[PDB]
Design an enzyme around this catalytic site. Structure first.
Site, PDB file in Angstrom:
ATOM      1  CG  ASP A 193      -2.017  -0.874   1.190  1.00 36.58           C
ATOM      2  OD1 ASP A 193      -1.818  -2.149   0.654  1.00 36.58           O
ATOM      3  OD2 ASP A 193      -3.295  -0.731   1.224  1.00 36.58           O
TER       4      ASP A 193
ATOM      5  CG  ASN B 160      -6.112  -0.511  -9.638  1.00 36.41           C
ATOM      6  OD1 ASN B 160      -5.021   0.153  -9.700  1.00 36.41           O
ATOM      7  ND2 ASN B 160      -6.981  -0.821  -8.543  1.00 36.41           N
ATOM      8  CG  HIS B 161      -8.180  -6.242 -13.470  1.00 33.97           C
ATOM      9  ND1 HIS B 161      -7.994  -7.073 -12.468  1.00 33.97           N
ATOM     10  CD2 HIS B 161      -7.261  -6.808 -14.354  1.00 33.97           C
ATOM     11  CE1 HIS B 161      -7.096  -7.950 -12.438  1.00 33.97           C
ATOM     12  NE2 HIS B 161      -6.666  -7.915 -13.523  1.00 33.97           N
TER      13      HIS B 161
ATOM     14  CG  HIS C  42      -4.137  -5.840  -1.972  1.00 33.62           C
ATOM     15  ND1 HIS C  42      -3.059  -5.196  -1.287  1.00 33.62           N
ATOM     16  CD2 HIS C  42      -5.199  -4.996  -2.055  1.00 33.62           C
ATOM     17  CE1 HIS C  42      -3.527  -3.917  -1.220  1.00 33.62           C
ATOM     18  NE2 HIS C  42      -4.867  -3.710  -1.604  1.00 33.62           N
TER      19      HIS C  42
ATOM     20  CG  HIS D 268      -7.490  -3.335   1.588  1.00 34.40           C
ATOM     21  ND1 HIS D 268      -7.091  -2.438   0.387  1.00 34.40           N
ATOM     22  CD2 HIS D 268      -8.693  -3.113   1.713  1.00 34.40           C
ATOM     23  CE1 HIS D 268      -8.207  -1.513   0.342  1.00 34.40           C
ATOM     24  NE2 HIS D 268      -9.255  -1.988   1.156  1.00 34.40           N
TER      25      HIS D 268
HETATM   26 MN   LIG Z   1      -4.303   0.498   0.209  1.00 32.72          MN
HETATM   27 MN   LIG Z   2      -5.922  -1.639  -0.723  1.00 34.62          MN
END
Ligand SMILES: [Mn+2]
Ligand SMILES: [Mn+2]
Ligand SMILES: Nc1ncnc2c1ncn2[C@@H]1O[C@H](COP(=O)(O)OP(=O)(O)OP(O)(O)=S)[C@@H](O)[C@H]1O
Ligand SMILES: [Mg+2]
Ligand SMILES: [Mn+2]
Ligand SMILES: [Mn+2]
EC number: 3.1.-.-
Lengths: 194, 409, 84, 140, 394, 48, 49, 42
Positions: free
Chosen positions: E14, E121-122, E199, E224
């Site tokens: 992160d 990401n997607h 994650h 996360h």
């Molecule tokens: Mn984060």
């Molecule tokens: Mn995250």
């Protein structure tokens, strides 16, 4: 209080030779489309299906019908259908029809055609009426909602999605319709003829 | 001609990667052409590749636009071949302080074919850090960024000194500026160039710029004659038209080479001439050009027809109610172009190792029509959109084929 | 045939009005053809602690065509586990 | 949604009855107006609730509302904040069992938040064919 | 421990690069911290760096966000250092077709410290991919579909030590159904160390329960969660230890972000491992506390029976100001070394005060405008927009 | 002054009052025209 | 800018003058309500002009 | 024509500044006392 399914034909971009259909699922029904892909046209037809009033200042020039030039036929027939379940357990289906003709002139004439309301009773079909003026009254009663609300609240145009957050006097104007205030104000004006 | 004392340079420009990235049928014409240029670079054993500019069509290219450009460079610019060029210019003056050394002088990347470039109008500095899309590639070590102009007022232009054997090369860079702003700076004589002086001569000079050649506005175009006389050859990087053949300007004394784009962005007569990239071989004070046509380019044909003077159905469409017949003539016009378009594609790929594997694309057609007529007469014009729609499956640009208009006087 | 535009400016004057500044030429340096271990250590590229460490890197610098170090990987296949 | 009953200028021979309507916010004692003094995200959530709340008051039987591109013109932080906001409404109305909400959006990012919840069975789409005629498909 | 068999891994997560770089004061907050992470990677002589994910804050990172991440990787990841890691999994199975081979096997780009990350990401292409094509960062953990869960561990070896690195990027229903299937090497079985980094999906609605995962693992990493709990803990039911690396910059001003932040060096020998935490210096100082007005002894409710607006401000000044006192001292304690050789300038600390103005009865505490209150500290706090948030318990 | 108030020195988000909705758009022109004040002289002389 | 001069309603003995305004965009002969598009650039530009 | 435009977009403002038809742009800044001040810059 629920709406079951919709079917468009020959409206704006939508093609006139093949009906397009979309079914709504409780609670949420999603619609995504690329920019300038006729995403907003679905809402307009839903409005015209129930309240039977064309978009604003759009009834001239056939702005609400698949332009005749694109298809290539001087005559274009547009149809809109709506299936729904009344406030009572029974469910009906509504239809409306528009026609547009291209004369020799660039000018074109919008003509309203007959519609109907059908009873989809268990293993039976019946015709409720065929007069649109009545059908306007019928449809509103079945939905259990009055026409004023749909004009400015339930089906909001894209640009004015923030009407409650508009200029205050412009905010004021709409409520006058929403309350259906005007019917009774002219009843008072009828007391001014007195 | 390839030899120890000869330097071969590849020339390309206005590759406009990403153009029409989301058209269903023409999405992969933007980059696949680009992926073929580098494949030419490795195959043809060129020393270094010089991109005219406008590498990316959009200021902020999408991942797909960027991803395919980096992939193609990595495959066709990294290898065990050792570079045969010597970098005599000071690294700090032209490049960023983050990585002053040239990319192929780096110890951690085995660069085989260095690629040079200059930012274009669609790729001008922007964002927080004045970063242009190229800058991301340069930090990755795959592209050498030069010809950058930090201050628009005081234009300082330092050549890049390159030498291979006895052949000595100087590379003058002058990146994109607002068209008429560069008009004004040259007029004021504020601009200057810095000559080499180790010999005080015997240096070949090559200049690449991305300004318009001729425009209606007197200021918009950067006049050719304003350039100095000591240059030898110039790379005019903006005009998408292709005139790869160099031409010696009489007053100056140098040749002018105008490459032309790799894709046809705007359907106009200029972008109809077949596309080419050039192999520029330099030795001593001499240069030679070996034009190489591109195979993967989308075919394209354009015809200009004025109805009033058209011999075909010249008076036959004068009768009243001419709408069914008006289209009838045109349908025969386009179909000829379709046939002609499909003829060119076959000619280029008549013989190849993968000729059978490759599939014919859908040629692009554009028919510009003028339909002004005397007042007592008139021609009916069908809907432009429907007129093209009937070709669905025969032309890639389905939405538009014809563009009717009437001249304004 | 060529297109001529009369801007009514003396190009000969422009040429002599241009100012040319001499720029120094830097002397050439080797492009890391084959840098010895001491060269890297002298440049601080190499840490003596790394001496004797096993290297699996298949990397080769340019100019090392004659010398090739082979890398062989014994790929161990995977098995789907009986998930409880 | 505040209002003024006495918004009519006295007329000798006219009722002229127009009632002012002006919606305002409250934070503690302060009751400053929201036309300004608030971020873009605050308004878009505000309008949706009013349309929602207002509908049931008049009818209370039909839970039909039609938002249009509500997430348009929003910065990154607000759209997800908007997304979770809609999530609360539907769950609250879910117990009631009367809400037929139609929402249209052409932002790839916004749509995935609702479908990820997986309460909605499927989402529709609109595309332009070779003849540029809208088509409707169903996707899960 | 630093030997021929021990394997040192630098674990992060992160890093939310690009987070609020529009603001003038905190623009350098994000990417500078990331640089310090890699600077530790080369200085501490690690063998691989394992990014917990979310390497980029915005799915469409701005150029300047990417430019500085690529600049940081190139200087630190690429070097003459040899790599002592032997790759045993087939490249085709767990890599994209463009460049299936791991980066440091490439015959054209030497990599001193390979970088293993999880998908970001997607929107096929993700943000990270632009890095992978350049070869700077290796990839793994990609999942094709929610229904079809198949985890292919990446097997790596150094001397005698054997490491397995499962990847599970990015829903709660599927796990309960037991659709997930794990590949575990049954050859030489029992001598493979196992490490699982996951994650939790941002957009799921619902989080993985520690009891769902298998029982053969050794160590696990949650990405996360932003609160930092670096020292591992063992769950008696599961039978394996768990570690929570925690973020690198305080994204949301809440109690969790208060705890000091660290990045761990996960040393592994044989089947056992040892962990030691490295405090992160460049992180912006952050102090937060919550005060209930009614219960506050310091106030003793001298506002309850009287007017308040005039002196309420006076009351908080002593509270806000002293927070800044310890805000700098802890920064000073960590910056005592090096005698401020670099970054000698003192950054403006972040302060957040959580006050509840609930009134018992017949009392009206006066609340000042947030913005006007906040900006009064211009030049003493970075987050001039908001320094206190006022709320009433419902 | 009507133009000064409505057109010239427009308010920030009100900058798009040419694209405010038809009825609000109408409330705005009727102001600029200075028309409402001469509707008042007509209605006074009508009462005459 | 299509000001409707026929919006004026006919009172029993009075003109009741009132004009209804709505701004439209023209592409050839066709004219559209101009409301509902996503071309924010077009919106701001048209307001300005 | 004496158009006045307010913006804090580096892009939008740099375009017109480079246009050379804008002599200069003014600025508004919050001083140590959090008080607005105007400083002229070209
Ligand atoms: Mn984060
Ligand atoms: Mn995250
Ligand atoms: N009479 C007509 N004949 C043919 N096409 C029409 C006609 N009227 C409108 N259209 C087109 O039909 C499409 C309808 O799109 P809309 O639903 O109004 O907007 P939209 O598709 O939602 O795009 P957005 O919301 O601005 S991203 C547009 O491309 C119009 O240009
Ligand atoms: Mg729309
Ligand atoms: Mn170009
Ligand atoms: Mn160009």
């Amino acid at each position: 209080s629920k709406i079951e399914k919709l079917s468009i034909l020959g409206v704006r971009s939508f093609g006139p030779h093949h009906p397009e259909t979309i079914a709504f699922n409780t609670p949420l029904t999603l619609i995504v489309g690329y920019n300038g892909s006729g995403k907003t046209t679905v809402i307009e037809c839903l409005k015209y299906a129930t309240t039977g009033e064309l978009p604003p200042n759009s009834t001239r020039n056939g702005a609400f019908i698949h332009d005749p030039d694109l298809v290539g036929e001087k005559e274009v027939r547009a149809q809109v259908k709506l299936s729904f379940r009344s406030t009572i357990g029974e469910s009906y289906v509504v239809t409306r029809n528009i026609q547009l003709l291209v004369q020799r002139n660039n000018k074109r004439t919008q003509k309203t055609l007959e519609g109907s309301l059908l009873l989809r009773n268990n293993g039976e079909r019946t015709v409720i009426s065929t007069r649109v003026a009545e059908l306007d009254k019928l449809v509103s009663e079945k939905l259990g909602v009055p026409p004023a609300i749909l004009d400015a609240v339930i089906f909001c145009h894209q640009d004015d999605s923030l009407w409650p957050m508009s200029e205050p006097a412009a905010l004021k104007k709409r409520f006058d319709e929403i309350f259906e205030a005007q019917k009774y104000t002219k009843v008072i004006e009828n007391i001014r003829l007195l | 001609t390839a030899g120890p004392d000869t330097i071969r340079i590849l020339v390309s420009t206005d590759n406009h990667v990403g153009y029409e990235e989301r058209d269903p049928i023409r999405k992969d014409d933007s980059w696949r052409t680009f992926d073929e240029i580098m494949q030419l670079a490795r195959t043809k054993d060129v020393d270094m590749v010089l991109l005219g500019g406008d590498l990316f069509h959009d200021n902020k290219p999408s991942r797909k636009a960027m991803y395919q450009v980096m992939r193609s460079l990595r495959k066709n610019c990294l290898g065990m071949k050792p570079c045969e060029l010597e970098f005599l210019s000071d690294p700090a003056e032209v490049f960023e302080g983050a990585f002053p050394h040239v990319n192929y002088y780096d110890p951690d990347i085995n660069v085989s074919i260095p690629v040079f470039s200059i930012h274009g109008n669609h790729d001008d500095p922007s964002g927080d850090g004045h970063l242009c899309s190229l800058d991301l590639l340069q930090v990755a070590g795959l592209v050498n960024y030069f010809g950058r102009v930090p201050e628009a007022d005081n234009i300082h232009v330092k050549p890049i000194l390159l030498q291979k054997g006895k052949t000595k090369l100087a590379l003058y860079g002058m990146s994109n500026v607002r068209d008429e702003r560069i008009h004004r700076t040259f007029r004021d004589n504020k601009v200057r160039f810095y000559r080499p002086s180790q010999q005080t001569g015997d240096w070949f000079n090559l200049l690449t710029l991305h300004q318009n050649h001729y425009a209606h506005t007197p200021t918009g175009y950067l006049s050719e004659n304003m350039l100095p006389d000591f240059l030898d050859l110039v790379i005019w990087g903006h005009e998408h038209e292709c005139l790869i053949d160099p031409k010696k300007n009489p007053e100056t004394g140098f040749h002018v080479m105008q490459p032309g784009s790799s894709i046809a962005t705007s359907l106009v007569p200029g972008e109809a001439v077949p596309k080419h990239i050039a192999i520029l071989s330099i030795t001593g004070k001499s240069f030679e050009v070996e034009k190489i046509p591109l195979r993967t380019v989308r075919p394209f044909v354009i015809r200009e027809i004025t109805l009033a003077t058209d011999k075909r159905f010249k008076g036959l469409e004068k009768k009243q109610d001419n709408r069914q017949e008006v289209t009838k003539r045109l349908m025969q016009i386009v179909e000829e172009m379709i046939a002609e378009a499909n003829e060119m594609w076959r000619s280029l790929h008549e013989d190849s190792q993968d000729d059978e594997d490759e599939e014919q694309p859908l040629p692009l057609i554009r028919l510009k029509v003028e339909y002004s007529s005397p007042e007592g007469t008139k021609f009916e014009v069908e809907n432009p959109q429907r007129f093209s729609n009937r070709f669905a499956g025969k032309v890639a640009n389905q939405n538009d084929v014809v563009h009717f208009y009437r001249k304004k006087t | 045939l060529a297109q001529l535009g009369d801007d009514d400016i003396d190009y000969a004057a422009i040429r002599r009005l241009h100012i040319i500044e001499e720029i120094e030429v830097r002397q050439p340096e080797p492009h890391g053809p084959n840098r010895t271990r001491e060269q890297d250590i002298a440049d601080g590229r190499w840490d003596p602690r790394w001496n004797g460490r096993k290297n699996f890197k298949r990397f080769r610098r340019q100019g090392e065509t004659g010398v090739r170090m082979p890398v062989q990987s014994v790929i161990v296949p995977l098995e789907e586990v009986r998930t409880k | 949604i505040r209002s003024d009953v006495e918004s009519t200028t006295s007329s000798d021979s006219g009722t002229r009855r127009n009632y002012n309507y002006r919606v305002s916010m409250v934070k503690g004692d302060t009751e400053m107006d929201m036309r300004g003094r608030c971020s873009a995200g605050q308004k878009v959530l505000a309008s949706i609730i009013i349309r929602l709340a207002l509908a049931e008051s008049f009818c209370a039987n039909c839970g039909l509302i039609a938002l249009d591109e509500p997430t348009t013109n929003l910065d990154s932080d607000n759209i997800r904040s908007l997304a979770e906001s809609l999530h609360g409404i539907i769950k609250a109305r879910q117990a009631q069992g009367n809400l037929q909400l139609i929402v249209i959006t052409h932002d790839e990012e916004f749509l995935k938040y609702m479908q990820c919840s997986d309460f909605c069975d499927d989402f529709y789409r609109v595309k332009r064919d070779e003849k540029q005629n809208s088509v409707i498909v169903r996707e899960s």
